[PDB]
């Protein structure tokens, strides 16, 4: 347990799977969705991951 919670940050993962996946962070994700509006409202066949990975870097 000790080497796992320090060497691979087992606890920080638990902190971040509710914060990030589940919007437990709140701010960062709303700011993400706020940047993500004009892209996502377009029909998604004309969108690709290279713009999303570009705007993700970017808030974060």
């Amino acid at each position: 347990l000790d080497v796992l919670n320090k060497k691979y940050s087992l606890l920080d993962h638990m902190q971040a799977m509710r914060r990030y996946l589940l919007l437990g962070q709140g701010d960062f994700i709303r700011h993400l969705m706020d940047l993500l509006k004009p892209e996502l409202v377009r029909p998604a066949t004309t969108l690709y991951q290279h713009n999303l990975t570009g705007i993700l870097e970017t808030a974060v």
């Binding site: 962070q25 709140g26 701010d27 709303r30």
Partner: protein, 420 residues
């Protein structure tokens, strides 16, 4: 996003400086502006953030005939702030024309700071209602900023004058400022002088440094009301999402405040809420009923007990309104502030839309009408003549607040589908 603070009037610049010192002490900075190495905190909403370890507070220093502002200017905190917006009677029309002549250059200063800013949510005004030199001018600049930015929100923190009347021109000044406050402003935080006066005379037996303690009390309120915005929030950490529920219609947009520690010169959320519904916790003094109620709690808390709490308030029926529609008492939570010791670790605030303030309006509606029948209280000078030769703006103001009283009374009734 970010919100720009504007301060005007003598009392307004006083409480603005008090609020800025409150947040310098609250956050990890020194009074030089130099960021402290001693630190849930964000300083990016109200302070212009550089790398440069001098986070210049976003406050526009505008005033008419400055006298307290000089004493504010020479201070051991005046190295932390210098945004270069400093500029140099007690009637509404005089201050109105005086703001009218210089509005373009001070609006150029506003445009400068708006250009430097990237995002904007609102303009929050430090203001005093019928404050004399501040009023008139403040309403005109309010009209200018409301005209010039239609995509933005406007909030005011302003105290309503209540000395239980003697100023002979105060109903005129407060009345005209109120007309601009309804039709050129959309978020009004209302506070009374006399309720804070009675709370101060409850805790102490002072009458002379009253403005100091009132500054402290209202400063606590403006920090608490903005804490969920400044400290990282996820439920109405925007102003618009906050006052969305309390504004059912864009004529009725008025808020009174509550606060649980009042006179100190279980702690459960059940108890602080049952406290906060009492009218002695309200800072504004035929039944008049609420339209919609919002509250925030800051502390170290559970969530099953708030379920029992708001269930208890429900079965208590100690908040008996009947407007027309299926609203709620709205429980929300914010972070309790670290980095400074504070008493009452569990502390609550409420903002609601209440029709009781119509009675206060009717006081002025009585008073001004009496003075309008006498006509010795308009003071009738050249500023008043050049502002309006017929004083028909007084009649337009009167019919506007008259429609507002009608809107209050229709909103209290179960029929507000019935228009006039």
């Amino acid at each position: 996003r970010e919100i720009i603070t504007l301060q005007l009037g003598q009392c307004g610049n006083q409480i603005g400086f008090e609020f800025w010192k409150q947040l310098c002490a609250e956050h990890g900075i020194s009074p030089e502006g130099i960021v402290e190495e001693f630190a849930t905190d964000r300083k990016d909403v109200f302070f212009y953030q550089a790398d440069d370890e001098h986070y210049i507070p976003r406050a526009v220093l505008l005033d008419l005939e400055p006298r307290v502002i000089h004493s504010i200017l020479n201070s051991p905190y005046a190295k932390l702030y210098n945004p270069e917006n400093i500029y140099l009677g007690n009637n509404w029309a005089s201050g109105f024309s005086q703001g009218e002549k210089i509005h373009e250059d001070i609006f150029d200063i506003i445009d400068r700071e708006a250009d430097g800013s990237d995002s904007l949510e609102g303009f929050v005004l430090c203001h005093s209602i019928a404050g004399g030199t501040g009023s008139g001018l403040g309403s005109y600049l309010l009209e200018r900023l409301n005209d010039r930015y239609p995509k933005k929100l406007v909030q005011t923190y302003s105290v309503f004058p209540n000395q239980d009347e003697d100023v002979v021109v105060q109903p005129y000044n407060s009345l005209l400022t109120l007309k601009r406050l309804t039709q050129n402003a959309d978020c009004v935080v209302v506070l009374d002088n006399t309720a804070l006066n009675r709370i101060a005379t409850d805790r102490l037996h002072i009458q002379n440094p009253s403005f100091s303690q009132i500054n402290q009390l209202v400063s606590t309120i403006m920090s608490a009301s903005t804490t969920t915005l400044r400290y990282p929030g996820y439920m109405n950490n925007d102003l618009i999402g906050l006052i969305a529920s309390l504004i059912p219609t864009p004529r009725l947009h008025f808020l009174m405040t509550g606060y649980t520690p009042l006179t100190t010169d279980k702690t459960t959320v059940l108890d602080v809420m049952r406290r906060l519904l009492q009218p002695k916790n309200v800072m504004v003094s035929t039944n008049h009923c609420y339209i919609a109620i919002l509250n925030i709690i800051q502390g170290e808390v559970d969530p099953t007990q708030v379920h029992k709490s708001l269930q208890r308030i429900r079965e208590r029926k100690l908040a008996n309104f009947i407007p027309w529609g299926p609203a709620s008492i709205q429980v929300a939570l914010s972070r309790k502030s670290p980095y400074l010791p504070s008493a009452h670790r569990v502390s609550g605030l409420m903002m609601a839309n209440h029709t009781s303030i119509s009675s206060l309006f009717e006081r002025t509606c009585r008073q001004y009408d009496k003075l309008r029948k006498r006509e010795a209280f308009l003071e009738q000078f050249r500023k008043e003549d050049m502002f309006k030769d017929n004083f028909d703006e007084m009649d337009t103001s009167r019919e506007i607040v008259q429609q507002l009283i009608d809107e209050y009374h229709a909103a209290t009734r179960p029929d507000y589908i019935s228009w006039g």
